[PDB]
Design a protein around this ligand. Structure first.
Ligand SMILES: Cc1cc2nc3c(=O)[nH]c(=O)nc-3n(C[C@H](O)[C@H](O)[C@H](O)COP(=O)(O)O)c2cc1C
Ligand SMILES: Cc1cc2nc3c(=O)[nH]c(=O)nc-3n(C[C@H](O)[C@H](O)[C@H](O)COP(=O)(O)O)c2cc1C
Ligand SMILES: [Zn+2]
Ligand SMILES: [Zn+2]
Ligand SMILES: [Zn+2]
Lengths: 212, 210
């Protein structure tokens, strides 16, 4: 089965004033021109859809599920939603993450999302040596990130680009080694034309690559 | 002179939590050693209002930049965010308590970071950015983790919780940073983890109260 999952981590969701949403929408345009009829596309909007965070209730529920105790109606409701998010994630073999860079790390709701999809025995497992990803079946990820600064000049900025470093480390771990990030970078330093034209060109290439 | 405890544990107060036990041991030692004229404040991220960056916040910020009028909702959220910022700026000693969930800081702790990293307030675009909190402030992070992160292996390379916090607080001008790793809760006996962690926070308490 061929399914593409769009993980939209932008707080504005669909507002085209945003650089990363424009770039994504241009990606989506090219991608749909090129995919098969056998290819489904799903999207989760992290700032619009319900994405449960790890809280007392979730930790309590996960404790009980280890003992085999009964869950309260609240624990059932939140664990069920988290199961839907996990299974939706495992159901896809192409992923597109869209995010603005805010304070050198992933958006908080994207952290909640990671907390839903990094699940022992589901996307990774523990081993004698340590732990190992379970999603090693040729999946592909494209990250689209807009940023005010430039992160490819190998300087202090590069060193604190934790958003990219974390996402690549996490997904590489789960088994996704075909990874590309498109950085619509330098929005605070470069001509809007230059930033956008370069990011449109890059996601056009990505669409072509991902559609084969 | 004020100490600010930033509690990023979703369980808040539950002593089944290793990071909370270690914090409470720290706090009890600290309270014994500090002076009368010293205030301790605490914000519990999972039991308080810490605005996340959403549509409303972003729009409020754009309107503040265009000199446009704010809606009541935009007003209310930005007022709460400036209250959090000022509470953060008001303190010279900080304690962050967190469990390690998925190799990064808790999501509410990122929200908190988004409230306190503010231009012209805790840093300034300037030639480069510089921190405004360069007045000898101290930062203690108490972190509980299943794994061990001090062996200089793969685990060390993905400990983004510590790496991020240290980089952000250095950037704000807070260079006196110390992390207490109550680590190995997935491999060592719980009493073994606690004994070492308790000694670290007892020395931290003494050093910070001095
Ligand atoms: C609250 C906030 C925090 C930001 N933090 C960073 C940052 O840490 N590094 C950076 O390069 N740009 C930062 N920026 C600039 C944004 O990344 C830049 O405006 C980007 O174009 C936003 O993407 P978008 O247009 O899709 O929303 C920040 C902007 C805001 C509003
Ligand atoms: C959802 C979840 C994610 C976790 N992720 C990590 C991890 O990425 N690295 C690690 O060393 N331990 C991880 N752990 C183990 C916890 O860090 C460990 O249990 C720690 O003791 C929890 O802190 P606490 O006792 O203060 O709640 C995770 C635990 C849970 C429940
Ligand atoms: Zn287009
Ligand atoms: Zn309470
Ligand atoms: Zn024992």
């Amino acid at each position: 089965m061929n399914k593409t999952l769009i993980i939209n981590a932008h707080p504005k969701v669909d507002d085209t004033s945003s650089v990363s949403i424009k770039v994504f929408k241009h990606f989506l345009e090219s991608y749909k021109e090129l995919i098969s009829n056998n290819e489904t596309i799903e999207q989760i909007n992290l700032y619009d859809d319900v994405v449960p965070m790890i809280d007392k209730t979730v930790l309590s529920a996960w404790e009980k599920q280890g003992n085999g105790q009964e869950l309260t109606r609240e624990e059932q409701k939140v664990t069920e939603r988290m199961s839907e998010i996990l299974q939706q994630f495992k159901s896809a073999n192409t992923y597109v993450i869209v995010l603005p860079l805010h304070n050198f790390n992933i958006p908080s709701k994207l952290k909640d999302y990671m907390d839903n999809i990094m699940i022992a025995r589901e996307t990774f497992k523990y081993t004698e040596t340590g732990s190992v990803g379970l999603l090693k079946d040729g999946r592909r990820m494209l990250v689209i990130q807009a940023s005010g600064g430039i992160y490819t000049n190998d300087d202090w900025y590069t060193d604190v680009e934790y958003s990219h470093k974390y996402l690549k480390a996490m997904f590489n771990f789960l088994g996704i080694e075909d990874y590309q990030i498109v950085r619509a970078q330098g929005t605070a330093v470069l001509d809007p034309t230059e930033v956008l034209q370069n990011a449109y060109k890059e996601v056009e290439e990505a669409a072509s690559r991902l559609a084969n």
